[PDB]
Amino acid sequence: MLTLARQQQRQNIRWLLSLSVLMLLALLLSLSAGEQWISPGDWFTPRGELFVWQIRLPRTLAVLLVGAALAISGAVMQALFENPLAEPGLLGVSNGAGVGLIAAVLLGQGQLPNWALGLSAIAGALIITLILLRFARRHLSTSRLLLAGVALGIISSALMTWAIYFSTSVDLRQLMYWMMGGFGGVDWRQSWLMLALIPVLLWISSQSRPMNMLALGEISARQLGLPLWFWRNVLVAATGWMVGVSVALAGAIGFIGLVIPHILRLSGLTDHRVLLPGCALAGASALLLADIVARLALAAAELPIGVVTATLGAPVFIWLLLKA
Amino acid sequence: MLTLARQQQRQNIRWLLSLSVLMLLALLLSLSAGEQWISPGDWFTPRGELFVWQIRLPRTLAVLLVGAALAISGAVMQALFENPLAEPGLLGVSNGAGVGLIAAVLLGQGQLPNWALGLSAIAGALIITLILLRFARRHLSTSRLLLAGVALGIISSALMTWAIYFSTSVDLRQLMYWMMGGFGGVDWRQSWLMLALIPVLLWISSQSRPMNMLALGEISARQLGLPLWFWRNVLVAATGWMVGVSVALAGAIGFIGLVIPHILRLSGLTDHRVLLPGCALAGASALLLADIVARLALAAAELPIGVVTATLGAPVFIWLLLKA
Amino acid sequence: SIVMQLQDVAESTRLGPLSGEVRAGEILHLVGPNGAGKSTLLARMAGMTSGKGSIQFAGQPLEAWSATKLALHRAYLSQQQTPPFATPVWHYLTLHQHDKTRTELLNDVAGALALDDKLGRSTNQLSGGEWQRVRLAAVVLQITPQANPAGQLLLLDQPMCSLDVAQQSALDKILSALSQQGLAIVMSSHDLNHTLRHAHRAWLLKGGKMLASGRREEVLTPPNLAQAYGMNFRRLDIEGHRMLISTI
Amino acid sequence: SIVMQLQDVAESTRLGPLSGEVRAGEILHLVGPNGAGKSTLLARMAGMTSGKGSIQFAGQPLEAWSATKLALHRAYLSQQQTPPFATPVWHYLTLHQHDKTRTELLNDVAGALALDDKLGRSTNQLSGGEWQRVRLAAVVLQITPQANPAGQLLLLDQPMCSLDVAQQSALDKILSALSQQGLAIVMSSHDLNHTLRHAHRAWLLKGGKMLASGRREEVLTPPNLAQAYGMNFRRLDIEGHRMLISTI
């Protein structure tokens, strides 16, 4: 090389620094925002362990995690399927978690101890992803595998919509909070899910090299020494697990794992060693903001993230393609 | 040598004959199936003149029309944006029509004379497609145009969801029938719409050549004498017109303009000279079958097409990629 | 009989300003190093691009031709093109014909490049050379004077690469015949010997600018070639073959 | 000193059954018409494909190498490849290096193919030849004996096409250098004269089968070439060049 490593490395580090600082500020923002603004001064008062410890601290944390997860999953899939519209809830995994949830309610008669439902959601996701693996191991072309996945998702939609037809315990709003996402009822009880997300997130970020190789030809990558038939399976696995836990934790969340990686690329983040971490911080920040604006935007009740997320994101999004 | 050119012609005509014959049978099917099976013999009785003339016949016709429109629109977009997931309700037009509808109810206070609502839907569709044209005329690369279009769709979603929040006449059943499609209340009163669909359908089907040219390189086509910047505009226009009338006529209908053209291609319909008419006849039958299954499947009421469509289609769909 | 005429054609720092002319029945070769800007000039000549300078084609200017009439009097072959999916050769070829009526033509022209047996095969399922021949045959059918009285120019960007010796020779015959029937043919060639043997007129280019132009034998002189490529070159004439050797 | 060894390698009706060997410091050329199946055989040799027959590389058979270990002792260059979007040259190159520590090497190797000034450009924004040189440069860097003591084989599918004369000469020097440092090199070539001048051994092929194999001088004989391509060919030798002419 000439000097390019310094120019590009320096601009990369500046980007990541900015993104992380934004995320921290969003953290303190949500840790204080709500019905009653609690300035850092009064963070240890009795109105601090209730509003800033057993309430916003785990919800905000879960938001950062799920946002990071979704955005990374986005990046990965878009690069695996070689297609712009690759989202995470596009192979049915997001819908599979739902079928698992309802299966749990109905079967369990609705007397489960809450967490049993979260576990079922993870199970639905795992089922689907495993099926997906059997469809990929057959050496099917990516073009065909994707289609097969879309189709799985289409089946699962029709499957969970039917189970809702018999359930007596069909709650009117819980459906809308589950199908547009929300962290309203998220306490430390969900701590296990938050743990289950961390390792996979870390690991998948470290994996920039093989994604930089996938960015070339299928063949150039095989030749440079990548095991495609493996990495494809791994990626689908990791993605499905992350989407699975996210849904088990907050429900079906869109927009993030579609736009957040596009926006980053449109701003010139091509390299994966900067895009993978980029996606995590931006995804986490975007979601956090959408949460801070979905819980205290309507004195009446709590909006679902699938509203505020798109409501603000897409306007801003057009503003970036329109000219920039 | 050159028996090949002719060989494929014989197989083409056999396929189209099969599809059309299937479509006729579907026609007589719905014309008789229902609450009370009216055999073709008793079609002139007073029961025939009320059930098989001002009830099933104009509803069945609309269904054939919309099904053909959706599937063709699917094929056209998938080949225009160079992408398997191109659907019709993907550039917002489907959502645009909705925004127009609601705007109509709220503004009109909810005293409109029905037909005014259809016009509103068509208006929403035109607004969007018009915008899309301004985004294309700027010489934007296909990839960028698609992304911007998806983004318009996301905005319209977030807009349409807000208007439903300030409306008294929000019926749960009517919302679900409009957002998953339905021909429940379709009389001869809707005849004008059925007309507005016909010419564009005919016209777009005659247009196989330029699409066979799009099927090669952007550049091979430009040099062979295609005006891309024109055809792109035309296609977006036609597609928007068809989707618009379709939504104004039956609501949001998915699956068809996504699966019906993929399936046709997997069975080896590559040439557009056969795929465009193929898509119309197949698209018409699939939709027609689903209506015959959504109006007499539940004694209680009428299911919405977005259920039965995916419910039967996806299982069968997987069955064709699984092995075939 | 001048079919094409270029004046002050330019494009950024990748194609300096040129001006030449293309006569009706002369095979012109565009020769020059990587970075000479042959593909650029050729694409511009094809009307695929707009920009600085102006060029006139058939007594009318390019910027005044419709993409459709233009594809009647001009056929262009880009340097690289990817084959379409599951598209049978016979179809790809017949898609370039203005007169689909003439099937005997498709058999002779496809036959010359040895595509007889392959008419029924899909294009994404060929050798590199085979596909390249398919492209060449399509573009010929699109401008063949035996079925198109409107055909005049025919641009070709390195259409000889990946073709075996025999096929190369066959194409030489084909283009020879088209040029004899009064059809301009312009193409880049990195095979100097081939230019010396088959081209009528040449255009030596370097760094975007034009170094020498004219009779192929007055252009490909060891001193000119020494400026363009940067290396000594000896001419030789054995048994009447006029080859070109390099002193490396 | 045998590095590669093929026995009864076959693949459908596009590559009949062959058996040969690849020596340690030697340049082997694959010659033959379109449809000879050079690209298929080369791909097989690279481990990109499995099928009939068995071949052994560095005392072990291919169907037993890790995708990662193989890319240490073998570098392969597919016939045609599309450049990645907005991927700067320097990045593409450094992505092929096993030892990113060595930057001098990247400058020497990229410099040889005249990529000094172009290190900062995106790869989808080059001439055809320029890109081709970028590919050639990466594959050399991946197997450069000056930074990889595991590097042995090096396959190349027609890597000379779209390269100008000068560049062709430059790559020739490089491959000669690698071959002298104990590195096998196998590649297809449609330029008989070139093979005659630079190849150690050749493998003449036709319709999938092997016609002749051995010294470049015992393989490229006018009757052999007459069987493979189907045309008379005369030999001639001036000042020590042994050229090859065709009687068309």
Ligand SMILES: Nc1ncnc2c1ncn2[C@@H]1O[C@H](COP(=O)(O)OP(=O)(O)NP(=O)(O)O)[C@@H](O)[C@H]1O
């Ligand atoms: N997309 C691009 N953007 C900017 N510069 C470009 C682009 N494509 C090519 N160039 C430059 O334009 C010049 C001419 O390219 P080109 O017209 O292909 O020359 P050429 O004679 O065809 N070389 P070659 O194809 O190897 O035989 C070169 O210096 C390229 O670097």
Ligand SMILES: Nc1ncnc2c1ncn2[C@@H]1O[C@H](COP(=O)(O)OP(=O)(O)NP(=O)(O)O)[C@@H](O)[C@H]1O
């Ligand atoms: N996808 C495919 N399906 C069927 N046959 C194929 C396919 N690809 C190539 N072939 C055939 O395989 C044979 C040899 O292919 P290939 O290995 O590219 O030969 P080649 O020596 O490289 N010819 P060339 O690239 O022109 O120098 C030819 O007869 C082709 O028709």
Ligand SMILES: CCCCCCCCCCCC[N+](C)(C)[O-]
């Ligand atoms: C300003 C820095 C933010 C603090 C970082 C938060 C990490 C909290 C982890 C503690 C786990 C809480 N606990 C023990 C109840 O599980």
Ligand SMILES: CCCCCCCCCCCC[N+](C)(C)[O-]
């Ligand atoms: C085979 C994997 C087994 C995973 C099951 C793990 C159960 C953890 C969930 C218990 C809930 C934690 N709790 C009770 C504090 O809420």
Ligand SMILES: CCCCCCCCCCCC[N+](C)(C)[O-]
């Ligand atoms: C191929 C099937 C053709 C069916 C066409 C029947 C359409 C006639 C409709 C006329 C309606 C007149 N009206 C409104 C008084 O009923």
Ligand SMILES: CCCCCCCCCCCC[N+](C)(C)[O-]
């Ligand atoms: C804006 C130009 C077109 C005008 C739109 C209205 C024309 C068709 C609507 C007529 C309604 C038909 N019908 C049967 C209800 O009377």
Ligand SMILES: [Mg+2]
């Ligand atoms: Mg070029």
Ligand SMILES: [Mg+2]
């Ligand atoms: Mg080849």
